Amino acid sequence: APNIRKSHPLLKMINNSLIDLPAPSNISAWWNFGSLLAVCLMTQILTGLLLAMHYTADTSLAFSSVAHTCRNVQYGWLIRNLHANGASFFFICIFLHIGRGLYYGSYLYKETWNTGVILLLTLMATAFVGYVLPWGQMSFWGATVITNLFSAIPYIGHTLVEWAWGGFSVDNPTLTRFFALHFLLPFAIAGITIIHLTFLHESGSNNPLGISSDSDKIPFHPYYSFKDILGLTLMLTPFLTLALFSPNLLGDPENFTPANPLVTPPHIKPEWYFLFAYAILRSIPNKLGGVLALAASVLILFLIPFLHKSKQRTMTFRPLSQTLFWLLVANLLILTWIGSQPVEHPFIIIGQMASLSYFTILLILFPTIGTLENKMLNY
Amino acid sequence: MAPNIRKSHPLLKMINNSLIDLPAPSNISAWWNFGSLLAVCLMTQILTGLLLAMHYTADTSLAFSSVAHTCRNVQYGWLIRNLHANGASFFFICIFLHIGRGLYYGSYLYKETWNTGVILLLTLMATAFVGYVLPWGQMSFWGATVITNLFSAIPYIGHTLVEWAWGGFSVDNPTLTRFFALHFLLPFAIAGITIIHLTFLHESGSNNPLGISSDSDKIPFHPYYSFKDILGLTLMLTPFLTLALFSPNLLGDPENFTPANPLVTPPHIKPEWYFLFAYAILRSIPNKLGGVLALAASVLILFLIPFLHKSKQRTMTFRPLSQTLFWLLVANLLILTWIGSQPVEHPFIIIGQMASLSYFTILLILFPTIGTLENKMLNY
Amino acid sequence: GELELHPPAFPWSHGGPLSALDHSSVRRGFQVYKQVCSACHSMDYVAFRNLIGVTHTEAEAKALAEEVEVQDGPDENGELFMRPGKISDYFPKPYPNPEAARAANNGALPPDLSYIVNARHGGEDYVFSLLTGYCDPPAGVVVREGLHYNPYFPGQAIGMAPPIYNEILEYDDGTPATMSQIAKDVCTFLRWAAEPEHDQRKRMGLKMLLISALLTSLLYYMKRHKWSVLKSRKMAYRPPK
Amino acid sequence: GELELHPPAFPWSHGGPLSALDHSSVRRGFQVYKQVCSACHSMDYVAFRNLIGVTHTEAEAKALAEEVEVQDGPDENGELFMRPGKISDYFPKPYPNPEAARAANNGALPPDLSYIVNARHGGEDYVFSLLTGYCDPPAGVVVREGLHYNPYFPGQAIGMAPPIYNEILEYDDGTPATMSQIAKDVCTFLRWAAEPEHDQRKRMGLKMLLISALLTSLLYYMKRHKWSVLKSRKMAYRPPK
Amino acid sequence: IHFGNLARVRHIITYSLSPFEQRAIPNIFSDALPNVWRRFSSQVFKVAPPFLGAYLLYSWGTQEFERLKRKNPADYENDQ
Amino acid sequence: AAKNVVTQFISSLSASADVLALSKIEIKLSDIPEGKNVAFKWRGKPLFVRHRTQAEINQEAEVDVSKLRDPQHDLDRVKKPEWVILVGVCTHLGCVPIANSGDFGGYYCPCHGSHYDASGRIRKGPAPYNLEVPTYQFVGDDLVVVG
């Protein structure tokens, strides 16, 4: 082969996925999130390792090791900030990535979609175990509240839980296994991300009009490498602005207090990116039902590919679906909001409304409106 | 797409083109069984490693006892600990036979598969080095000290590089915690690089003991080699387990059953057997800087092998002079291993330099020379 | 018991995203802590050396640390013993453990202040409103013996007796030690104790913004430049027709 | 200077790959340790509960642990205090710290015995030779005051006076407490303290061998079976010649 | 696709039997062992030698090291 | 072979020996004076074992609280008469009630009120449920084994 970019067994790979890779000419900024998610992942792993090199997984030293890192390690405070806040940048990006997919029917690429669902699940597990590490009050209680949910599974209940804790409650044995899990999972994410992109390359990218872009493809480089680099700095600015000017904006002050099993914080609530699910959890008063609801709130994503009724791929030319789409987005902000609120009136009733509409829109309305729209096109 | 889903599917296709319909020479011997063992070995270290990691505490004040707590309280913690420590040795025995096979059969002529291989070895050594420090016993600490102090011998950037590595002025807690992170991490790089290793390899396919094209006679990896390899696995796995279950501490230093103490230097600071050969070469050059280079060279020398092939034939199967030279070298290595475990005194000192010298000579001068000589004896 | 009073937002001199801490105020705040709060409140994460180059001179810090006796050891016979403090020591603990602390405060536990302004919603505005907000309970409300009424404390019955009052101490810099002046200083000090990186963090923020502005603009032009080829591209359908 | 006497190999009842520890011997060994060695030697990694089902009854172990007072706390007033031992407590330390230990042994430090037989080359053969090997120094050799001559100790001048002698204690099982009998028992006990898993490990080893023998043969046949196709294969070159 | 593009091959016939028609380990004494011996024989003089030399050097050096630890009476013959 | 190796590795994740050693506590019933409440440490949290004198299975066992905030029926989940064993943790915010006071002679949580009777039931207070009653048994009367 003439150029070594195609013959070489490795460069060939780099070339067929980042240089001569055929990309639609009209993909928008919504397609910029895949790369941000990747970069985001590289960054979490990097700052993570740097933190891990100064952390001590022990109930008696965790809290202070994080403090020692922020107070003594050269730029430890900066690394800690970037890691904690990076987790949020990661979720913001992942939610927009998903949104883009629902709106544009990217889910029709079934395998790319399913691996994607798996990436999200793994990312959550990662952030959950990560959060416990500093061993502050919300660290401990959040760990407690969620893991206790599984004792609700009949039969294998108390077992699965005491197996997970490595004892009778969240304690040191839990902390150490959680550190190993936190260190490990990101690497599974990186792995699965490769599979994600592998299935994706079978078809290539979808585009905003939802029609074949074979008639007009352009090389990933320089078009998208530039577009993506730009998208990186555009997002990276607010990220840094937040982490450098308002470091604790998103965090709970309760975590600046060493965990204490003899003092339940008044309002045990998760980081923002889990609030929507926390709301759905509490919507079903009944330990077991709520757990299933929580599970279903995310597992529901595996069904999306089978609820597509439209004759068109995207929602670009489907105004009824478009509003339903934004209704859903608002539905989510509402759940997020309910999640941060105590379990009282009127939040309780509002919560069930939001939880119920959530599942209805995805399970019943979207497929239905899609069918309806097919008729209005005389199809 | 295609008839069977084993070829069309974007993933199974991968599994099929590397473990089922993969064309393999019909005559590869037991020496080709080490690649698969290395892989399995790697999966096992990672598995037992994680299980140990879930009960470990990277702190000078708790490390030693966390390992003890694991062995004494964790269900089968004692077994996992044994399998992990001894598995490291199974790993090196396998890696050394893997390399040997390669030298003897000219596998190194597959340059990229070879170079990634050298990288796998280096990464494996770093992994075991940092791993060894974790229990924080006496040999853990002093081995860490002895080796890391070698870099303060590097010119100008010396002292810096070292105090940077330790995260202070001596091997201490900051060193331990970063070593844990490295130990947890590197194995994953090994898995990664192993994929690249096999990827380059598949460009050519396996070499074989006669060193001639096997296109005229290839057989599917499965069932021929999947069976041969599974058999190879149990055959090796037996002595491994026999050792780990009947003579758990045969290979370890008793000195490591004592908590690290910076105020008491053990009498004989020596590494696990698989590093002895290199330790011998290190100590062969009295001169901090020269020894360090010699140590470095003892392994980096592997990157030159592809360029020192002079024979007109690939393997050594039909090269009797090279064959003896080859076993001379092997014996040379046992000797260095032996010298590595001995104190630095007469006659071990002089013997040591002889062995170190012959080591480099055989690979750098004799092998290429004898190869050329043999070419003439075939009237070539 | 329901209903809570939320503090107001005071205009701290270190509130602006680009505004550092008033180190002179931090220095006085240290004095307050050292002479008043340190009697019952521990500050485990700060050491005397931390003051150097921030609020005190190296000579000053060394003297401050020496005013304290620390327990070192064991010695030859495996005995603990006292010794004068070094700048590497951390601010001394008022009590051996929490049990002893509660024992000396009516079963109430004065928390470590190292991260207090971040461990409480409201931060310094909260701590400030609390210190200067003690008053008599409204009608219908009875404070059980040992507790003191404070509208700013949840439940309104705090176990800390008003810690500060006018002239309770003298600032050796000559500042008028009024009650609110004191609270203001100690709160500014608490901010610094919670995050010594404060100033550097903001100085970095400034640099991040400028570079971010510059670089984003530059990259925008480059993206546009390359894409101009497709943006201005024109096409036509010309069938043999 | 580099001279050293290497112990001989005694035929321990737990030396065979398939031979467990003699638990009756381990029980006596515990007594020796508890009544003799524990005076100066700590065994930090073993707890009374560990004896249960190995050498003692649960009732027996609970009584043994109660013979000891342990320091618990803090209490209400943040005070340390004593309490009777539970089977979850570990064997009591003879000294607070090493400094105090040397202080009471002429600057010599009696090491923790939890892993002694693995922290020394020779293991129990070494510990046994040592205990029963004290004797007078040979001509030309002088042992400095405070040290005792032992040919088995490196340097031959040990800081431990001969710890055991005939009838230094009475075995409540009625075994004749001769010096060598005692050493033998405590050494067997030490083996167990270093590796409680000892018996389970060997029982497992037995199972690993049988299964290994069975599975290997089976797999050998299968490999052979499949390869038979190639092994017996015949070929010929038939050119149109 | 690696099967079908390997080599240009002509006029070779091969005969093979199912594994179920034949024996797994045939002619152990008439063929196997003889060959095992044959294989050992053809290699022993290439492999053994250096290993034997290694052993010698090992023995020498070990014994020589111990001999140097012993005392030479010739250093005390006039110490009266 | 696989079944065993997997079993071993899997069980390496469940409670280790040191932990199981604190799994349960055995309390001697015949050493707990009447009326006088005694608290022990069990699983890091307080464990209440009070000996009901005579005016306890009566004064605080005949109460007529029509609508109860928690379906507390002693015949549902309890056992011994003069014996009451509770988990000394208020179900409000994890505080430990006190036996000295207790508006209803039982226990009082000095955190937000929460008054518990002699049977350890939420009376006057914010805490929803009643102090939890942990597993136990009397395979030896003069001894009880909680946990």
Ligand code: HEC
């Ligand atoms: C006599 C010891 C004592 C002194 C002196 C004292 N405090 Fe306290 N402080 C306490 C006690 C006791 C509490 C616990 C109150 C409670 O939780 O009921 C407390 C609590 C606090 C709290 C808030 C706790 C919360 O939950 O919000 C802050 C903040 C605080 N003190 C600040 C200070 C500062 C600043 C000073 C010096 C100006 C100071 N204290 C001096 C005894 C004292």
Ligand code: HEC
């Ligand atoms: C009076 C305290 C005391 C008693 C009692 C005692 N030892 Fe020791 N032991 C020591 C001292 C001191 C040392 C340190 C010796 C040295 O390093 O010079 C020691 C060292 C040892 C060593 C060997 C140290 C080495 O480096 O090899 C062993 C093993 C040992 N003791 C076993 C025992 C056993 C078993 C018993 C009970 C039969 C026992 N000791 C009872 C004081 C004692």
Ligand code: HEM
């Ligand atoms: C760590 C998480 C993830 C990484 C790193 C990742 C990465 C990527 C990348 C690089 C692309 C190509 C560029 C783009 O279209 O954005 C992509 C595409 C895609 N991903 Fe992800 N992804 C992640 C999570 C997910 C999730 C959670 C879903 C869905 C539940 C998902 C669904 C898809 C789909 C369906 C596409 C097709 C885009 C199209 O319509 O062209 N991905 N992803």
Ligand code: HEM
């Ligand atoms: C998928 C990427 C990752 C995510 C989403 C993530 C998320 C988190 C979260 C939410 C926290 C809590 C931060 C806080 O509030 O203090 C955390 C902490 C931590 N993470 Fe990660 N993490 C990731 C990767 C890693 C990796 C790869 C490592 C290192 C091998 C790591 C090491 C740590 C450590 C040591 C902490 C504790 C110190 C601290 O809390 O700041 N993380 N992580």
Ligand code: HEM
């Ligand atoms: C973690 C370490 C390694 C892994 C997992 C690994 C794995 C493999 C595998 C699976 C094969 C195919 C089967 C075989 O022929 O044995 C292979 C072949 C090979 N490997 Fe490695 N290897 C490792 C290290 C190395 C090293 C250190 C070298 C050389 C310095 C090396 C050189 C080669 C070469 C040259 C081949 C060609 C074999 C032939 O002649 O057909 N490998 N390796």
Ligand code: HEM
């Ligand atoms: C490439 C595979 C690996 C090698 C060659 C290796 C090697 C070692 C070695 C030589 C030791 C010291 C053993 C001893 O004598 O006590 C060790 C300890 C340890 N390794 Fe690994 N290891 C590997 C992978 C891992 C991984 C993936 C983890 C977990 C993420 C891990 C976790 C540990 C831990 C926690 C210890 C300390 C406990 C102990 O000393 O037994 N190892 N390893």
Ligand SMILES: CO/N=C(/C(=O)OC)c1ccccc1CO/N=C(/C)c1cccc(C(F)(F)F)c1
């Ligand atoms: C260890 O807890 N970590 C918390 C956190 O904020 O991490 C960022 C937290 C904090 C408070 C309450 C609940 C949670 C736990 O997260 N909450 C929910 C409700 C959740 C929802 C879905 C999935 C998952 C999981 F398991 F990660 F997969 C978790």
Ligand SMILES: CO/N=C(/C(=O)OC)c1ccccc1CO/N=C(/C)c1cccc(C(F)(F)F)c1
């Ligand atoms: C932390 O030390 N780990 C030791 C060990 O035995 O681990 C199994 C050890 C022990 C005693 C002396 C020297 C060593 C250090 O290893 N010694 C050598 C001589 C060495 C030689 C080459 C490369 C490397 C490295 F760095 F791993 F890459 C190390």
Ligand SMILES: CCCCCCCCO[C@@H]1O[C@H](CO)[C@@H](O)[C@H](O)[C@H]1O
């Ligand atoms: C989007 C790209 C943002 C990069 C911003 C780089 C600014 C970091 O600048 C930092 O400022 C600190 C305070 O003065 C100094 O102490 C550091 O040495 C310096 O590197």
Ligand SMILES: CCCCCCCCO[C@@H]1O[C@H](CO)[C@@H](O)[C@H](O)[C@H]1O
């Ligand atoms: C080559 C495959 C070897 C696998 C051998 C599996 C045998 C392990 O068997 C083990 O024996 C112990 C002693 O009885 C038991 O305590 C363990 O529970 C049991 O799993």
Ligand code: FES
């Ligand atoms: S925790 Fe008991 S009354 Fe609130």
